[PDB]
From a paper:
Here, we report the complete structure of a bimodular ∼760 kDa BoNT/A large progenitor toxin complex (L-PTC), which is composed of BoNT and four non-toxic bacterial proteins. We found that L-PTC/A consists of two structurally and functionally independent sub-complexes, the M-PTC and the HA complex. The HA complex is composed of [name], HA17, and HA33 in a 3∶3∶6 stoichiometry and adopts an extended three-blade architecture, whereas the M-PTC is situated on top of the HA complex platform. BoNT/A absorption is mainly mediated by nine glycan-binding sites on the HA complex that together form multivalent interactions with host carbohydrate receptors on intestinal epithelial cells.
Author numbering:
A (entry chain B), D (entry chain B), F (entry chain B): 206 to 626
B (entry chain A), C (entry chain A), E (entry chain A): 20 to 189
The structure:
């Protein structure tokens, strides 16, 4: 009954909430018994600034405490881990009727650091950052009930703060960040430099004018990913230039992790934002370029998604293609060519369907003119999950299926293109 | 008596917060407030008023007590280095006098040895917690109960507790 | 857009107090108070939490920014050496739980270059000011809006300002 | 018109109350004049921890300030004399109508240290421990009345706190404390060791089972005293063993100071408590033992008191015996033998009475069987003070008079046993 | 006049708490609070604001004054080494402005020489005590009485006193 | 439309009010946005004692910052300029309905130091002493109005405190202070010592009995001025002796600055006060004395003023005399002799009038007896300003005109004595 985590490969820092305390009163500051009418205060005056963060990890050698702290700084900009100048104080006035007790506990804000790879967590750290306390008030205990003996709880935590899950992707520090210092207009070609051979790397760029862009490598290989830097472009600004604010907190927009998958990106980019492109480990010594092109035409219909180029569709029968499934309400697109000679008469019966994930699909006929690519919408509201409906398409013609995931039942999406005749 | 439904062996026991100690009641002094005014007494738990009170036995020496207590429950040596303050406020009613006095509270820990459903040995540790004020309104020359001033035996101003863990052999 | 009815040249701009920064919201931690109690969180602006945030451009380096800002407006280097405290107080309603969290506020300064009624370059400086608390009452397991916890882009919790002065050449 | 102090010989520390101030404004912190509506605070923030205790003594060489402090630590466990981390603060909001003044004074808690010996104080010290202030509020002074000149008061103190007299006996530090490391069951014989020859000393012991015990030296010489250690047995515990908590705060239970007085003790001892026995200066080089015996029989009727063995009752006429009087509601007992040959017929007229103290007496006939001592109650509710009632008793027989003091008019109790025939 | 029903000789005189000094009124500064807010001003009596003011005469030099005052009354040299704080709180009424200013108060001591029911010589010592705030609500441009700002001659804000002791010869 | 400043020559320190802030938010401590129900505090805890006073001057070489501070100490007894132990704190509880903002500013108390000479300021310094803050509360800003751009204000200050102008004269430190150690009774003659030759100086003296005194130099040259030391005589006191309290804060009573003007002083002196006499720069090497004389007679009518001796009235026609005008309600007097032989019959027509200042005048006939000077009031309620009324007086006789200024239109007063016949 596990949730499917449709996260992209890489590092995430997750704020899992405030007001965490340890079991067995390990973080009890103490109790005040306030007689009725009176008041009581418990105070953290910060006469000493020292605090005591708690840290556990699955891998001391990658996710050390140092590394984990650096990641928390990348994600949320935390910078004091051992110290604090922040005062907290709890005050209680007991009502006229009855006495009152207040228990004060120190608290932690829980951060989780994950390395998520191909559908599971492969490295995990928990960092408990010292927080600003928990104060429970209760009625005065009565004499004497009777003291009932109890065994200690297992070691662990209890959250007393409100529910919280804030997920923030972070730039992998072991990978280089190259920069495109000029703002991209209509076209741009980035040659892949020898300073970053073979290893994966990021390209930080910005755009001159808000618009939809097609981004790809030569021959659509390898597949790229694209991130938005969170909160970028709010500050310093130079017209037609990139301003790097050293932001390592990233939102995944789209892109496949399988580098041998032919694909291209179609994304809506803002001029008031910076974006990172991640190019993966390439097993070839051949030169390569990243092409950026502003789309003014029908290709704007494909934002925001990656488009798989399907090449092996040259026989009749059953064909299937597995990719990482987008999250709910996110997109994935496939461009394919119906096998056979294009003579504008010969036709084949095509059945498109998914195996586990439910997705709404729209089908496009693609013709290329001297004005660019043209997309004719020939089918709308296709419900893909185990779809039995078929449609007749032209042999030798080119189509694009755009798929919006609506029910995420599987980490992967499995598209089937069954062809008969 | 000292009978307990547990197996044979040694145990760490957290007996709760809110313990006050005998004879020690008034040694921090107190305030006299009058006629509508408000008195506020307080303290600051650091260093040399946070030094705990050990009461060891032939089996359970001080080091044993400290180590087991700090392993299972709160590590008081690390905690009591970071200052924590507390305060109490009382208001005198018009045309009357109020006296308020302050005393430290402690968490009570125990190391017990159990043999045939019987506690045959017990070591005690008091770790400084916060504080507690008692107040009384008085007239000139009014006799006050000794019990208000002087505690004969340690008691807990809250509900006592018994949170145990069995200690396993080296 | 970035259009402005000013002449050509460089300008210092005070954009007001009350700016909070993206992502940074919860890094100081927060309190959970309950059932009638009062929580009071606070801070003290000195030394190494008063260090400002610079965002320079090819024309306007850090020194330029500092010097012009401190000449025209407040000299933050002299001011931020003298400790100033601030506090917020929230009270939990009976039988409910309240969470309160603290974040620094900043004065936002800008250096802008204007050419033909258009801002073609902008440097930014955030100088630590005071603070700001957000609070929410919650139930066990109640889902809370991400927007309460996490700020995506810098905003001003007050009315923004635009107090300018033209900078003349050396 | 002096109160009789029926204290036993030795050292006492007496808490005489809080809120003491000196005369002539020597301890005035100061005055705030608060206009109506406004508020005013006077604060002791303890930015410096220094305090200034006041000390006077009658004997610099025994009761020095050091010694006196050690005694206060023994009695009440005070340990900070020069310092304090305890804050106090006075706050006043003036009513809407009139202005208000607040005067704040520093205060002291007054301790008295006495050496009480044979009916008077022979050494006396007063230690004023710095306390937590006195705050009097008054109405605003009116212009101008007229300033009336006044001479300064004599040097001294004024108590502004509530009435308090807490008397706590303390172990004399010049005397050794020997220990009986084994818990006493039914019988025990403690040989008196040469390490503590001639000088008085204490024996710290505990009991296995709550019960009444007869304690005495060889031939009931010398007389012993017994104390309970205050608040003992609340903490550490080893079955059948003594746990010494180094408690020097002692409650006198019973016992005579006159060491040449033949006597034995009959006391109710708790298993959850420790007790001290004080054995006095003995002017003999002969060996001696302290005998402890659990009483299961009629001797339980004599708790808690000392029993004087009266030896010189061998003629008819007037016989009188002077001892330190017990306090009100406390006991003293006398065991005597009616002069003459015991032939079960010959009888004498006996008149028992006191001279100044009023006491209720009960008379016992004592016969010893092979089962122990037997006590037959033959007279109840004897009002001793100048009693004229007489009773006929058997020549040669043994009796015990148990006396409860009800009116303490004299430091001594004077028992008269007048015999006629 | 300076006539007194006492014998011939020298005297120490405690003239009471609550004395304020001429010209010195506003030298600590003051607060302006507005529209419902509360202002709280305060001080801390230590070291170099607790240094007393001596005014000796040919007969009574400073040492004489100090020694006699500290023998009979409070020893200010020992006391004024231990910090004591004080505060005042004023609240501005809605839609009005309030100004509040602080000044030290002093105990006034005197050494007097009396000859034939007449004071022919007088030495004065002012020892710092606590403080005192004056407040006023004001309108923009409202003229305020000089007397509110400026004290021409030393006065006592409380009832004056005259607590004397005759000084006997060495 | 400038106010006439009828100040005497010399130095003045002026408290110009509290709650001064600089323009363009240079002294903003900051803003708190308090949600409804909640409270907010801004605190100056003085963890560091440093403060930052602001100083400007017209003349760095006389009125340096050091000098100016010394002057502020002379006037108001300020002594901490760089430091402060005084806490201030602003607290605001927002009402249940709406949110609230509080802005806190640091403030200054503004002092002005002037050197005023012959009708204008010749040296000027402004010293802004750090104060105890300004707190404005406002309603919560609404989204978003719209941000309207504004140019910065000119550099300067804004007063947020109440209106205040407190003017205090101070002793010029470059001039010596001589002392008359004996209290003045009925007569006293002070010889002018060679230790202070040529340069102007002050004489500090006191009086034995409250009364009116005539003070002058030999032959009424040069003119003297007299000041009262502010708050003197409140403290130490020795019968018949001067007690110097080193008070440099002075109130001008009366006296001319023109040293070649024959004059004498008639002033009401208190025994419980000290006074300074200023004797000006004298361009002569001749010895001189200051005469003090207690007036018991009619000369008491001339207090408090200077009396000009008019010598050049020896022809008929127009005669005019210019002096510094007293302030409103202050006095100036003229003693003159009607030209001609005194034969008790010959008479002249006299017209007395002023040119710009309105003054009420009373005329006295002066005859000297062997009992002293006699003053007969012969004319009352003379309205001097452009007076056309004339009066017939005796040739060779001596008169004194006492003038009370009622409307100050000019820095100078111009008296005209027109004589016809
Ligand atoms: Cl699927
Ligand atoms: Cl008796
Ligand atoms: Cl005129």
């Amino acid at each position: 009954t596990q949730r499917v985590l449709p996260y992209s490969n890489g590092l995430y820092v997750i704020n899992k909430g405030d007001g965490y305390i340890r079991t067995n009163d390990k973080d009890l500051i103490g109790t005040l018994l306030i007689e009725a009418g009176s008041s009581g205060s418990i105070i953290q005056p910060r006469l000493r600034n020292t605090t005591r963060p708690l840290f556990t990890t699955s891998n001391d050698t990658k996710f050390s405490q140092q590394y984990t702290e650096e990641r928390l700084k990348d994600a949320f900009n935390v910078q004091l881990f051992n110290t604090s100048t922040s005062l907290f104080k709890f005050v209680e006035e007991a009502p006229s009727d009855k006495n009152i007790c207040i228990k004060a506990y120190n608290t932690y804000e829980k951060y989780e650091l994950i390395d998520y790879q191909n559908g599971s967590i492969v490295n995990k750290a928990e960092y408990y950052l010292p927080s600003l306390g928990y104060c429970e008030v209760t009625n005065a205990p009565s004499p004497e009930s009777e003291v009932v003996k109890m065994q200690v709880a297992e070691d662990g935590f209890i959250q007393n703060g409100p529910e919280e899950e804030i997920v923030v992707g972070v730039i992998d520090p072991s990978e280089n960040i190259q920069e495109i210092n000029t703002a991209i207009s209509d076209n741009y070609t980035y040659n892949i430099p020898g300073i970053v051979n073979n290893n994966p790397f990021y390209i930080l760029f910005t755009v001159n004018t808000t618009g939809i862009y097609k981004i790809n490598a030569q021959n659509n290989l390898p597949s790229l990913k694209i991130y938005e830097a969170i909160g970028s472009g709010n500050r310093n600004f130079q017209s037609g230039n990139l301003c790097d604010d050293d932001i390592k907190a990233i939102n995944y927009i789209t892109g496949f992790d399988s580098p041998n998958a032919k694909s291209y990106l179609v994304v809506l980019l803002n001029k008031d934002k910076n974006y990172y492109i991640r190019v993966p480990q390439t097993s070839s010594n051949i030169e390569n370029q990243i092409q950026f092109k502003r789309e003014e035409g029908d290709l704007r219909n494909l934002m925001n998604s990656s488009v798989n180029i399907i090449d092996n569709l040259n026989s009749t029968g059953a064909h299937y293609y597995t990719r990482q499934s987008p999250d709910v309400h996110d997109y994935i697109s496939y461009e394919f060519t119906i096998p056979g000679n294009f003579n504008n008469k010969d036709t084949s019966n095509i059945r498109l369907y998914t195996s586990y994930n439910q997705g709404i699909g729209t089908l496009f006929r693609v013709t290329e003119t001297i004005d660019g690519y043209n997309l004719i919408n020939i089918q709308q509201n296709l419900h893909l999950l185990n779809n039995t409906n078929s449609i007749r398409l032209l042999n030798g013609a080119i189509y694009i299926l755009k798929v919006e995931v609506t029910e995420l039942n599987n980490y992967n999406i499995r598209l089937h293109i069954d062809i008969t005749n | 008596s000292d009978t307990i439904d547990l197996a044979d062996g040694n145990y760490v026991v957290r007996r709760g917060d809110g313990w006050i100690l005998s004879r020690q009641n008034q040694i921090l002094g107190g305030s006299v407030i009058s006629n509508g005014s408000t008195g506020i007494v307080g303290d600051l738990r650091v260093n040399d008023n946070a030094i705990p009170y050990y009461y060891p036995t032939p089996s359970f020496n001080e080091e044993y007590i400290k180590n087991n207590i700090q392993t299972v429950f709160t590590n008081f040596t690390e905690a009591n280095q970071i200052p924590i303050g507390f305060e109490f406020s009382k208001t005198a009613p018009s045309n009357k006098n109020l006296y308020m006095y302050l005393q430290y509270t402690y968490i009570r820990y125990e190391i017990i040895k159990v043999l045939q459903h019987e506690i045959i040995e017990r070591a005690v540790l008091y770790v400084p917690s916060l504080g507690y004020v008692k107040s009384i309104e008085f007239n000139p020359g009014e006799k006050i109960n000794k019990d208000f001033y002087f505690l004969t035996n340690d008691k807990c101003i809250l509900n006592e507790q018994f949170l145990y863990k069995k200690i396993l052999e080296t």
